[PDB]
Design a protein around this ligand. Sequence first.
Ligand SMILES: [Mg+2]
Ligand SMILES: [Zn+2]
Ligand SMILES: [Zn+2]
Ligand SMILES: [Zn+2]
Ligand SMILES: [Zn+2]
Lengths: 286, 131
Amino acid sequence: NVTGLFKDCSKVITGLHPTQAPTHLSVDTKFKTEGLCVDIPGIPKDMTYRRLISMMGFKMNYQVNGYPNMFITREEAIRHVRAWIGFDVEGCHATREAVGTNLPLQLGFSTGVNLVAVPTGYVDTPNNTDFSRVSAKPPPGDQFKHLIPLMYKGLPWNVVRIKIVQMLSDTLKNLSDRVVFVLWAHGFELTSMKYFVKIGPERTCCLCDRRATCFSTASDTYACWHHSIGFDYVYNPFMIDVQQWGFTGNLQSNHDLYCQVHGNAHVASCDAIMTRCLAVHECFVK
Amino acid sequence: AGNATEVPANSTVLSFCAFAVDAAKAYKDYLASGGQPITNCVKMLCTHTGTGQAITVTPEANMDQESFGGASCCLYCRCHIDHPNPKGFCDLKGKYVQIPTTCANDPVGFTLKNTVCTVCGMWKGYGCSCD
Ligand SMILES: [Mg+2]
Ligand SMILES: [Zn+2]
Ligand SMILES: [Zn+2]
Ligand SMILES: [Zn+2]
Ligand SMILES: [Zn+2]
């Protein structure tokens, strides 16, 4: 059966050649027979194309020795409360040369900050995958009127991930040796993390013996929250999903069960605050 | 909307490798942990009376090997991530790739681990005969 991860979001009816397709499912039907594929010299391989590949549907259930889990139990989250950062992402929609996947528009945090990124995605070409800006539009509903202006307001992803690393470092430097991203219905937040998170075995900061907590692509090096200066990638974060603790309604509905001081000007940071707020109430009351 | 490209049996390994710093090392370490190699590749119905050389423009093969679509055997094409070439282009995409039938279980791992003779064009070890 199928999965939505890496869904081909092009509008082309056809594609792909046996040599250019990443997977058997994405071969054009002309080349399929007897459950296999066949080379047909007279059909040229497409040496121009740009196919948007969906990053929705990631699953982080790997179990490899040396590599730590991103998703952690509530108790592990309890022990690292000071590392908690609520995180929400409002998104936009692929719309011109593609349709059927969502792209990060505005990322928000428990720290009141909100950042907004240019709509960019992962586009397959005849030679490689091209990380690039792509056409997009706001979610249709009248409830999403406030992201109309955000479409114009920023910001290249190489800049966005510089600012994310700097904001968490300046927040977490004197509080913990890690992040715990506090999510609510985590799928799209996990998709955004592809844009600014690397993972591997545990590492130590060059310049330190402290746990490595950021990564730099300028040179393949690692750092702690204090020495992550100019770094662009968050390395081996941790995260929890409040919704997986049993909650019927939506985020605001379930938060307002405990707390009545967090109103909601519908900003991404406002959701991330209610996400962290509701996790504290659930975890430590009674 | 759209067209699904992949099958759930590959979700965990591709997600693991799509986030790695060193994707090739992640995949090796993943197998070493008892993980299942990447499936859903493009296997070719072919005559199996070909030259047997590693990377060709049309399917080659002997009865001792199987022919795949090159991109479907590239971990970087498979996970849609950067290639470690300075220009950043695939060696395999746009070509057919033959793989020893004994290793046809794990084509992506095979291309990660092996290398081709520039003199004679066959896989070093399966089998290049120039010294
Ligand atoms: Mg959300
Ligand atoms: Zn340090
Ligand atoms: Zn609250
Ligand atoms: Zn490739
Ligand atoms: Zn040779």
